Structure of Ycf58 protein:
Amino acid sequence: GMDIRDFFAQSAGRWFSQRTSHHLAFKQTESGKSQLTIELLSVDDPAVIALCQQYDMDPAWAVCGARVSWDGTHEGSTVLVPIMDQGSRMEGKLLREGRFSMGSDGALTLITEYETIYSEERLWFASPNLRLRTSILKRFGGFSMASFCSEIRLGV
Amino acid sequence: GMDIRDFFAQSAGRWFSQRTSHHLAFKQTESGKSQLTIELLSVDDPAVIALCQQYDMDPAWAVCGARVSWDGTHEGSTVLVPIMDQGSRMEGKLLREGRFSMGSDGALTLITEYETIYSEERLWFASPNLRLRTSILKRFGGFSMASFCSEIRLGV
């Protein structure tokens, strides 16, 4: 019964991420460990504002933001900012430095599609310290990748 | 918007299964390929009846059944039979040779818990020829396993 802002807040913190990807066509599989740092940003934060106008958007719509940093294979940091839909607290657009949807079950779904490339990710908490996510990648008329991630909260 | 019977019918067929499991506590991971054969059984089928009475159940409740066979590491075959809930076509009990729940999104959820061991699996179709499933295993007060499976329909 939580919304995006709640989901974003919950995600905040340091996590150990274990990723496994299945390459459908080649019946292969590659896995990789990684560290993740999710810090919730306030609508006031300059990073948020920058992204909004960047996407030609008004910061008055940004409900919150987040800075996701990783490390492990490659590494970096990106900022995400959700823009609400007409009178909605569950669906809208997600600005990346794509569309999102919060569901009754408390799981977030992200969808970004260009032309032949469709990407669908689903994130959810199995525990306040266990975030999981699945995803599929469709490309040139065929599914090409299916992935899973286990993220356990670190602490410190 | 499909129900169990529909989900069971859809699952029927031969599939190539790719499984990856993440062992949380030890930050490990093991993957394995496998073949799967799902044949839908009718309430009339003797295998179904046997299981019902076996679970001290009346075959008049069984909406359908299924024989799941696999191969690859270990191998075998088991039968599953869903028993409906009072005036319900989405939730109920699942007899294994545990509780189930069909959702609006068309994804099935299976839950079986003894005492300290909790098991939650979620199956769904990303395509009529792509069935996916995630799961978590809680044991002795701690999550111990998270898994993902990609199943692409074979044919023949």
About this structure: Helices of chain B lie at 4-11, 46-54. The beta strands of chain B are 13-23, 28-41, 65-71, 75-84, 91-96, 99-102, 108-113, 118-127, 130-139, 142-153.
